[PDB]
Design brief:
homodimer, mainly alpha, two-stranded antiparallel ribbon, 4 strands, Ankyrin repeat protein (chains A, B)
Chain lengths: 210, 210
């Protein structure tokens, strides 16, 4: 507001300010709401656009602009902006909804068998884990376990994970009625409680080595 | 431009974007062109406003808004944003034009007797020194030598430096017609070539221990 008067007062600042706004619109992720402007940002801000890939993906998913996730996938040189071991559960889960982005991450830094760990009992927009308290229960999982269970994650994401060496037999600890057991990607194959998509993913898993 | 349409498309982003613009206007230093808006930035962005003190001073001096330098001086908690040993000659010289800012820096981290070093032969807006080439000649100086010689630096800046322990007898190497000598804060006292202000600063220096 008062910027417009101060800017109109000294036009010499107009050039710098235009660059500054674009860097802030990139850094905030918001340019992902209009894919044409995202396209420009990568071509002529390889430093800034790349550094801000995490916020751009978050805005890209929230805006439901799948084309924006495609643009990010195309221009990603490595997975360093997506530190798998520090990301919050919601962002990792959302990344698994885009098989092409997942594939790019898997070929440039993601370990598909990394044991992920978040707090067991959630409470009700942070992208990175914060150690606010360490004396709370944690629950382990994997990219493949998340993919098998979540009905918003496509079958192709299971395919990509297996393709890049996700281990179909890597389990994690869970409890059921007080009894601890190992949870695997293939769990309870005979159930009226598996959705259609869950059943199709189990068949994919059983059929992979065929 | 195209931001205005995308912003008017989703008003939920308006709040975040307002915060983002202000952070970018702070980070760029530009808000120092209107002291009222600088005042707001320190009160409610102690993290951002403080982190961006170097760019804010630069804009404050360039805008000739001395009130903006006063506001920065008041809110500066320490001199860490002004690393004396990394700053370029022009920015250090400009800081010496504001005795109150200098005093705040001297009480929160500046060593007044630090030997400064920049390239001897300048060539024709970088605030930090960049080691682009190390095989070029460097020339040493001090805050007090700079203050004595520069007719844009007030006498009060010499007073502040002496007050905080600047050593009036700390010299540096120079050449005159091939012969190396030590340059001191008090150099050639008898000369029709000393300006009025230079003479007054020499008297200040001679008179300090009186």
């Amino acid at each position: 507001t008062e910027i417009d008067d101060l800017l109109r007062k000294n036009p010499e600042l107009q050039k710098e300010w235009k660059r500054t706004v674009w860097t802030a619109a990139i850094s905030s992720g918001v340019i992902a709401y209009r894919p044409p402007l995202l396209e420009r940002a990568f071509r002529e801000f390889p430093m800034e656009t790349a550094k801000s890939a995490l916020n751009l993906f978050v805005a890209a998913h929230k805006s439901k602009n799948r084309q924006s996730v495609d643009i990010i996938t195309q221009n990603l040189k490595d997975a360093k902006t997506f530190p798998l071991g520090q990301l919050e559960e919601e962002i990792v889960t959302d990344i698994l909804k885009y098989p092409n982005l997942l594939e790019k991450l898997l070929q440039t830094g993601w370990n598909p068998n990394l044991i992920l760990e978040w707090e067991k009992h959630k409470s009700l927009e942070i992208l990175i884990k914060s150690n606010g308290k360490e004396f709370i229960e944690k629950q382990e999982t994997t990219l493949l376990i998340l993919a098998m269970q979540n009905d918003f994650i496509p079958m192709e994401t299971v395919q990509i994970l297996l393709k890049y060496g996700a281990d179909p037999s890597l389990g994690v600890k869970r409890k059921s009625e007080g009894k601890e057991y190992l949870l695997y990607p293939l769990a309870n194959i005979n159930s009226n409680g598996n959705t259609i998509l869950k059943e199709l993913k189990q068949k994919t898993l059983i059929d992979w080595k065929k």
